[PDB]
Ligand binder design. Structure first.
Ligand SMILES: Cc1ncc(COP(=O)(O)O)c(CN/C(=C/CCP(=O)(O)O)C(=O)O)c1O
Ligand SMILES: Cc1ncc(COP(=O)(O)O)c(CN/C(=C/CCP(=O)(O)O)C(=O)O)c1O
Lengths: 351, 351
């Protein structure tokens, strides 16, 4: 029996008997141990993939949305709103539907994967596509929630992060201690901040004896945290993190500093390589943005900056089905052949 | 948190200590209690959605593939093959990658959802598109495996059904007994056969006191089990079940008969209605084919054929992200507007 995330960690969340539990049964995702890569195995470095693509709406956002929406409804909210590169919008839409309230999502025109758009569509969210990027959308949405009785459910809402910190809890619960390293993508920066919050809380509770080094990775075309200043024209095929001015900037920096980790850039080429590696070699399909976490691991490995005899946990943020269009970038679909055995056997390379 | 499905039910599966466990941590999916529909609630009827869309590759096929591939490898197989409408192929591809062997998938050109094609592509399967339908693909693929040393992983392989029967096990483990009714879509007929196998087994072992009435449903345009004869030209927007000559025909008929259930048809229009309902009302996004199960429940509720105060479990077979293209037929995507607050507030219907 898979429990609502809010119930699994009720004692560690800002809820009470008065809180309406709006759950689609999120969290408690699998922690898949990885075979390699060989580059890691030879150094006594093993990897685990926290597969967040198996959350109800396909991404880790559900962890924060369940709490955010539940608390909003508790406060009487009739509607919720959020700007998004796709996943937060899909999550807000699904939970709003579950709760029976209105969901308004603002998206950057042309920079949202088809899977995500399809989700906001089908779940019935009121969609607004703006002729601008995510950063513009976020600025606009916050102003919208200041002029109308609509609950803002973007990461700036504390409940989003309190809910997402549970990912750290689950890793420790399963492994018995926090890992030496925890890698994940960084877009608006709420997740890296939530992970660290989770690890610190569990360490204070004594459930984790050690504190992991947080390894955050941004796409080279949208790496404000890496360059040290906002990026006016963020660019990258991993549109989930096509973000130039992260709202949790300070949270990310502190997480990096406090944990002794890093926040670095990986190229779109490196993202595609890791993306293909996970799917073709480990049998795990995550969207490009998520693959950035693995790309980061590959990077530090090749540079000898990951200590031997360590456990590395990767947070694969979203399922690959979120963005099917990118598959054609790492593989080719063979043209159709006649429905005759001969043609099939040849096409299958069995002749 | 999720153990390999093979381990969870090791004692009830055809495995031993020498069986290589090829797992992506499948099974143990959530059983979501549905809010309605209203017609059900009025009769005290409760519905639960076994969300198979949360399996590693997004469909229930993983249940069968983990066993089929594990046993294939145990037999020394270097490759597996299967004809598919999309999901079985995606599953085979992912597990093949996991095990490190070859996966050959035969698909009907033009009739496999975008999400599914992306999966077989990215996971590295050797793809063959035939200018014919699924039925043709299965016929040709079986011939292939009768000649070549490639293990067939289609539902005709008994291991697929043994793996898939575990879904019934899980429902009983969680609910405490088998439900009064269990609805699911019927395409090639392997799943309904497997479901019944599972419930009978658990009932014989005393784990379940009752036996559910199996409710299978087919798309009106591809309903050979409803018409009583093979459908030469199956057609439906729910391409997953665009099948005219189910391989497990007798298995389906026997499950229907023995359980005291039925196998009826639902129109594409009714499928879209249930598809929209689940996503917009329950917050659950499943592909059209999966929605056929709910359409079937609406059908019987409407005909007053479900006992009041009964428990109904639905197997939502695949995640909606599998087929993003269909979203656009239940909702409209509004055109982009300027990145200005006023344009946004108006577009959001707030002014
Ligand atoms: C898949 C993925 N990965 C990764 C990432 C990064 O994370 P962060 O935490 O750093 O951000 C993302 C984002 N996302 C988003 C973002 C923005 C919004 P919010 O509220 O969430 O912040 C959406 O929308 O979807 C995604 O989507
Ligand atoms: C989502 C879904 N649902 C439902 C169905 C129906 O089921 P069945 O069991 O009755 O069949 C299907 C199919 N599927 C398939 C089929 C054929 C193959 P096999 O081997 O699996 O049989 C694929 O491919 O994917 C799908 O996909």
């Amino acid at each position: 029996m898979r429990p609502p995330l809010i119930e699994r960690y009720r004692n560690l969340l800002p809820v009470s008997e008065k809180t309406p539990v709006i759950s689609l049964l999120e969290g408690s995702t699998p922690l898949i141990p990885l075979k390699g890569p060989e580059e890691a195995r030879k150094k006594g470095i093993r990897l685990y993939a926290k597969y967040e693509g198996l959350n109800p709406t396909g991404s880790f956002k559900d962890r924060g949305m369940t709490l955010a929406v539940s608390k909003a409804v508790e406060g009487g909210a009739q509607a919720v709103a959020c700007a998004s590169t796709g996943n937060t919008a899909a999550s807000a839409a699904a939970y709003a539907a579950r709760a029976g309230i209105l969901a308004i999502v603002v998206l950057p025109a042309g920079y949202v994967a088809l899977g995500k758009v399809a989700q906001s569509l089908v779940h019935g969210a009121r969609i607004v596509q703006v002729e601008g990027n995510f950063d513009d959308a976020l600025r606009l949405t916050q102003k919208l929630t200041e002029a109308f009785p609509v609950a803002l459910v973007n990461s700036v809402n504390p409940h989003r992060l309190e809910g997402q910190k549970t990912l750290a809890f689950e890793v420790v619960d399963e492994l018995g201690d926090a890992p030496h390293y925890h890698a994940l993508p960084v877009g608006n920066a709420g997740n890296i901040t939530a992970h660290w919050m989770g690890y610190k809380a569990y360490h204070a509770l004594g459930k984790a004896k050690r504190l992991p080094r947080m390894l955050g990775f941004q796409a080279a075309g949208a790496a404000p945290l890496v360059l040290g200043r906002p990026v006016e024209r963020p660019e990258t095929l991993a549109t989930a993190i096509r973000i130039g001015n992260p709202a949790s900037w300070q949270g990310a920096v502190r997480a990096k500093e406090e944990s002794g980790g890093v926040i670095e850039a990986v190229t779109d080429e490196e993202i595609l390589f890791a993306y293909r590696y996970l799917a073709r070699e480990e049998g795990i399909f995550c969207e490009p943005a998520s693959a950035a976490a693995m790309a980061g691991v590959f990077k530090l490995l090749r540079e000898g900056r990951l200590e031997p005899e360590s456990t590395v946990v990767l947070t694969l943020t979203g399922h690959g089905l979120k963005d099917p269009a990118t598959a054609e970038r790492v593989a080719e679909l063979p043209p159709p052949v006649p429905a005759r055995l001969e043609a099939v056997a040849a096409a299958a390379g069995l002749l």
